[PDB]
Amino acid sequence: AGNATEVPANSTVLSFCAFAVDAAKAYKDYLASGGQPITNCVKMLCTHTGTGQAITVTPEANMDQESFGGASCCLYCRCHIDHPNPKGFCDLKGKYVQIPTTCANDPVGFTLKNTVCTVCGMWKGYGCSCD
Amino acid sequence: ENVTGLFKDCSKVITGLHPTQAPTHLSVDTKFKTEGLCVDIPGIPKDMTYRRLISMMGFKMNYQVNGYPNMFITREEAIRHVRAWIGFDVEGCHATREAVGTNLPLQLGFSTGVNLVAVPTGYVDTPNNTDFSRVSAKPPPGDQFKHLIPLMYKGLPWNVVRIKIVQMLSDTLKNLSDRVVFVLWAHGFELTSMKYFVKIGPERTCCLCDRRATCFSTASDTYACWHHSIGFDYVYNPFMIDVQQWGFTGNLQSNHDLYCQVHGNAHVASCDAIMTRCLAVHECFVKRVDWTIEYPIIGDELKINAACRKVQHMVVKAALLADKFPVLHDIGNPKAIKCVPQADVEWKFYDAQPCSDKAYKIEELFYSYATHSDKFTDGVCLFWNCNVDRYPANSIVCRFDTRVLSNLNLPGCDGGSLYVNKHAFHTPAFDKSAFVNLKQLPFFYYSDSPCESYVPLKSATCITRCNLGGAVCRHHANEYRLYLDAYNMMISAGFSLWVYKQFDTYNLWNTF
RNA sequence: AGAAGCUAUUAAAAUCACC
RNA sequence: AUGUGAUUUUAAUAGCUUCU
Ligand SMILES: [Ca+2]
Ligand SMILES: [Ca+2]
Ligand SMILES: [Zn+2]
Ligand SMILES: [Zn+2]
Ligand SMILES: [Zn+2]
Ligand SMILES: [Zn+2]
Ligand SMILES: [Zn+2]
């Protein structure tokens, strides 16, 4: 009964991150000390020619980016614990996420450390031009 | 294959999930999955009202991170923490309506003796969050499980059975240790039942204190030691251990019931966690006491041992000088340490096994009543801390009375108990049938020290030439009170002295 | 077209633990 | 209208290789 979701390569990182008082810090510490990133992320076959935005309802991917499904990059959605966002609503789940392709082998570790520029909707420092 | 039972979606909806709001690639439906890379079909919209019971079954805590302690431990690090063993067994209920495929925890039980029923509660993955909430459940089928039929009509929500696990653990392990070693038999459903009340994290220290931080508080994001955890709900770093990976083949009640005939009533949680701790005390301590593993000093460890050494030094010399035994045997004395060196008896060391030295030619012999009932007839045999079923008619026995409960005397296998004081002694059950050839010992103090020159004390128990006269000297009154303090603190600690039939306290008087 | 061997996909049964 | 698994078997379905 049921349709399996995980692979045994991600179990050792899912279990350890399932128990944590702070889910963001524990993934970074797993990544630093001999840790393989979370595999099996959801990836979108976009036209890969589109205007860049971090979070969109339809995948808008620039040529230097890869658009992932926003439920497989939010670590808190991904371990089934409660989001630390106020109103307890995930921002990323439901919308299509975007991750720069130089660091898109590990999406979850991109969405934990980086942030979205409020005035132009781009990833701050990764093409955000707010000088 | 390369699949795992972890986070296995247990809904009965035929369709899958949208490309977004799906946790992994294997959970997306077939309509979107093309060459391992999902496509956004703009025609099919996403679900906005749906509930899927995620199955938290199959956790594997084999991680290795630098600052984070490991949950599972090796059995040379669980014998060093034996004051912090709390058995754990969880009886589950299956989800029957609108979700099938996971065993939600129903009944938690500990070695303390406290059953905590919980409502069936699972991780329902809503559109916007993971809604930890009540799911519908049925108790297991069969006449093997019929005492879980009423329990699903009672229980508490998981925000009161998270605080009655940290109000019970904190009252049990307040004085034993500063960590907790959850002795589990399964290694599966227990871990599944530890998603609910355990949060591992980096090694922390108690707020406004100094002890290890073992209790988390989700309301106020702080940590506590076992003394200050009033109202704190999440257990911080526990340690666990799996007994089935020690080479056991078979059921629990067919491996406990070969060693113990006191526990019973299996498949109740408090009687699965009692058998699980009973068997794990057996598999580590009943073989022989291990003299290499020292233990911390909880309290009164220095005074009790020195008082025992004082009274054992006293009673042997009194019985030897009073009855003039030609030879004195010894049993169970691991080293060769002469208790009374200024004696005339020949100390034949009939040890149980040779322990790390043959410099004194300690003999090897095991004792049983029906075997050696007529082997030792000469003299007296000092069974200090021996564990034989029955003692012969000439002995000086000191047996630990295993019915007294204290912070020293942890409960143990077959009604006998584990007396962990600077070493671990697994003393067997204290039965009266062992002492049918012996009697109790009166209280008395005897010394050959000459009297030197305050409340006057008149007691016929003290055996000195000063108290035989009218005036009791001050060079013996403090001796008598110190000896009385040592004797009463020892008897309160739980030992029990026994002596042979012909012990006469008046034979000591004519020696003067 | 079949056979033989190896790895995998699904289904049924057996044994074992947990419930 | 099927409780978790693990290990064996036994059937079929895919490949990969060899032979006839
Ligand atoms: Ca169990
Ligand atoms: Ca059980
Ligand atoms: Zn999220
Ligand atoms: Zn910007
Ligand atoms: Zn404290
Ligand atoms: Zn038992
Ligand atoms: Zn005196």
Side-chain angles (χ1 to χ4, degrees):
Chain A
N3 320 314
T5 191
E6 293 295 332
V7 307
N10 287 339
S11 62
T12 306
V13 189
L14 289 200
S15 315
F16 153 74
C17 180
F19 317 81
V21 291
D22 185 340
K25 294 191 66 57
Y27 186 73
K28 291 174 200 171
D29 277 15
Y30 183 77
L31 210 54
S33 284
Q36 185 87 1
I38 302 179
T39 66
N40 205 321
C41 44
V42 191
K43 194 180 185 297
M44 297 304 292
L45 180 143
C46 49
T47 189
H48 201 272
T49 79
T51 187
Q53 207 77 260
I55 42 174
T56 325
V57 59
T58 80
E60 315 205 312
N62 182 263
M63 180 275 306
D64 313 275
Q65 288 81 354
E66 179 49 79
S67 286
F68 293 81
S72 165
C73 51
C74 177
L75 172 71
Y76 314 98
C77 286
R78 194 70 195 278
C79 278
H80 302 102
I81 45 180
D82 310 330
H83 288 64
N85 294 29
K87 318 302 151 283
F89 280 179
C90 186
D91 202 15
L92 312 189
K93 172 170 283 186
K95 302 178 195 296
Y96 281 93
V97 175
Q98 256 86 359
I99 297 296
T101 37
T102 173
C103 195
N105 55 317
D106 176 341
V108 309
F110 198 84
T111 59
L112 295 202
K113 313 158 191 167
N114 296 268
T115 52
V116 51
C117 176
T118 43
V119 300
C120 74
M122 274 324 298
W123 287 111
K124 185 175 302 185
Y126 268 77
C128 176
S129 44
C130 297
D131 194 285
Chain B
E1 181 87 358
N2 269 15
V3 307
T4 298
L6 194 56
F7 299 171
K8 164 189 67 181
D9 299 301
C10 293
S11 185
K12 277 152 72 165
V13 187
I14 186 165
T15 56
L17 293 174
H18 197 267
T20 184
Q21 85 192 2
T24 69
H25 203 272
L26 295 172
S27 285
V28 186
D29 211 329
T30 308
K31 310 160 175 46
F32 309 96
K33 206 186 299 178
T34 172
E35 190 252 355
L37 175 71
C38 314
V39 288
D40 190 12
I41 305 176
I44 318 297
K46 43 185 176 184
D47 304 64
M48 289 96 76
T49 292
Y50 74 100
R51 283 171 88 265
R52 295 174 164 263
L53 169 56
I54 302 292
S55 174
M56 306 283 164
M57 193 87 67
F59 282 121
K60 291 206 61 171
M61 321 295 298
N62 48 4
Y63 61 95
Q64 285 174 328
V65 195
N66 51 71
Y68 293 70
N70 272 90
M71 267 180 150
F72 281 70
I73 52 184
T74 69
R75 59 164 275 180
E76 190 35 53
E77 196 189 343
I79 294 181
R80 211 186 321 160
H81 315 145
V82 77
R83 295 153 158 177
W85 281 8
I86 290 291
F88 192 54
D89 207 51
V90 291
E91 324 266 316
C93 67
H94 319 95
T96 175
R97 273 185 306 175
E98 86 162 359
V100 169
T102 189
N103 317 148
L104 294 323
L106 173 81
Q107 182 158 38
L108 297 98
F110 298 83
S111 314
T112 312
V114 194
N115 289 11
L116 290 169
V117 287
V119 57
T121 318
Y123 282 80
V124 182
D125 189 313
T126 45
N128 309 337
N129 52 359
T130 77
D131 176 15
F132 175 88
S133 178
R134 167 167 184 166
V135 291
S136 85
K138 82 170 194 296
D143 290 318
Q144 195 182 10
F145 299 110
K146 71 172 299 302
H147 61 86
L148 304 201
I149 303 279
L151 281 193
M152 279 207 45
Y153 276 65
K154 285 301 162 27
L156 298 89
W158 271 99
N159 65 77
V160 193
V161 75
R162 262 192 280 262
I163 326 175
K164 280 149 60 179
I165 295 187
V166 197
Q167 272 190 7
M168 176 210 65
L169 287 173
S170 188
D171 290 27
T172 292
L173 311 175
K174 194 181 307 177
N175 305 306
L176 299 183
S177 181
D178 281 343
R179 64 212 67 228
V180 54
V181 177
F182 280 128
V183 188
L184 325 163
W185 172 267
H187 153 266
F189 186 46
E190 294 70 313
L191 277 175
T192 289
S193 195
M194 276 198 237
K195 173 65 176 81
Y196 296 88
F197 64 98
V198 169
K199 284 295 185 61
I200 84 178
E203 194 72 29
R204 287 293 283 254
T205 182
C206 176
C207 183
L208 192 57
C209 192
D210 193 35
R211 300 181 182 92
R212 194 180 96 97
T214 176
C215 297
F216 181 47
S217 175
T218 194
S220 159
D221 185 71
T222 37
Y223 310 92
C225 64
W226 284 122
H227 294 273
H228 304 161
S229 195
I230 185 55
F232 281 41
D233 44 347
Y234 274 86
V235 185
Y236 209 58
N237 276 312
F239 300 110
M240 59 214 53
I241 185 171
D242 44 358
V243 167
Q244 211 187 12
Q245 291 183 352
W246 289 356
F248 276 90
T249 173
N251 209 357
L252 183 54
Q253 211 178 4
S254 47
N255 266 325
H256 167 277
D257 275 342
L258 312 179
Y259 308 140
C260 170
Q261 202 190 2
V262 176
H263 314 127
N265 192 10
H267 269 302
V268 187
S270 87
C271 297
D272 265 37
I274 278 181
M275 293 182 197
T276 315
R277 186 205 185 264
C278 179
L279 172 61
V281 162
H282 176 104
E283 282 269 285
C284 293
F285 296 89
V286 297
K287 321 294 191 174
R288 44 161 177 81
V289 303
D290 190 352
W291 295 103
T292 81
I293 304 190
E294 206 165 317
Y295 274 81
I297 299 307
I298 289 182
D300 199 26
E301 319 302 325
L302 292 304
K303 280 186 54 173
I304 284 173
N305 281 325
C308 289
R309 291 273 184 194
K310 204 156 195 287
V311 66
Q312 183 186 162
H313 156 57
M314 169 67 232
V315 62
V316 300
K317 188 203 310 302
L320 282 196
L321 187 53
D323 213 341
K324 302 328 177 290
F325 282 105
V327 74
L328 166 142
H329 294 284
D330 191 328
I331 298 96
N333 193 340
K335 315 174 171 253
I337 317 298
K338 193 161 189 107
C339 295
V340 50
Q342 278 58 38
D344 302 88
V345 308
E346 210 47 52
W347 212 285
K348 187 66 179 180
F349 292 93
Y350 275 95
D351 296 23
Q353 62 255 27
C355 304
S356 297
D357 181 58
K358 303 303 311 192
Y360 309 91
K361 329 305 170 303
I362 62 157
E363 211 274 335
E364 197 193 309
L365 171 143
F366 205 94
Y367 206 91
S368 162
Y369 185 57
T371 68
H372 296 90
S373 282
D374 43 352
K375 292 326 284 162
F376 302 118
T377 43
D378 45 348
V380 57
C381 321
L382 179 151
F383 291 90
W384 203 264
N385 266 268
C386 181
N387 291 329
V388 75
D389 48 69
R390 198 172 297 193
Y391 304 95
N394 41 34
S395 311
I396 297 175
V397 188
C398 166
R399 190 172 183 84
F400 177 42
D401 182 285
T402 184
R403 304 157 315 177
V404 170
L405 269 295
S406 196
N407 305 295
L408 277 309
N409 181 46
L410 317 178
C413 191
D414 196 31
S417 302
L418 203 41
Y419 172 69
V420 292
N421 163 276
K422 218 192 282 292
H423 278 301
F425 311 109
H426 185 283
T427 64
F430 183 91
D431 44 40
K432 197 59 171 52
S433 65
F435 305 109
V436 64
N437 295 13
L438 303 98
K439 67 173 185 179
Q440 216 76 19
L441 192 76
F443 165 68
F444 63 100
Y445 169 65
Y446 166 73
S447 178
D448 50 357
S449 161
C451 188
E452 299 297 339
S453 160
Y454 155 72
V455 51
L457 263 292
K458 304 308 145 168
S459 315
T461 67
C462 200
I463 308 310
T464 74
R465 288 213 201 182
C466 78
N467 73 50
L468 173 147
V472 296
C473 79
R474 291 193 297 274
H475 186 247
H476 290 124
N478 56 310
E479 265 68 11
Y480 180 76
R481 57 91 197 171
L482 68 89
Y483 190 81
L484 183 60
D485 303 307
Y487 193 74
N488 54 60
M489 77 182 303
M490 192 189 66
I491 298 286
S492 51
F495 300 99
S496 44
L497 269 76
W498 294 81
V499 72
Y500 42 84
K501 272 280 163 282
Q502 61 174 15
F503 187 82
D504 173 7
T505 79
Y506 288 155
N507 69 2
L508 178 68
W509 275 124
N510 46 300
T511 64
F512 280 161

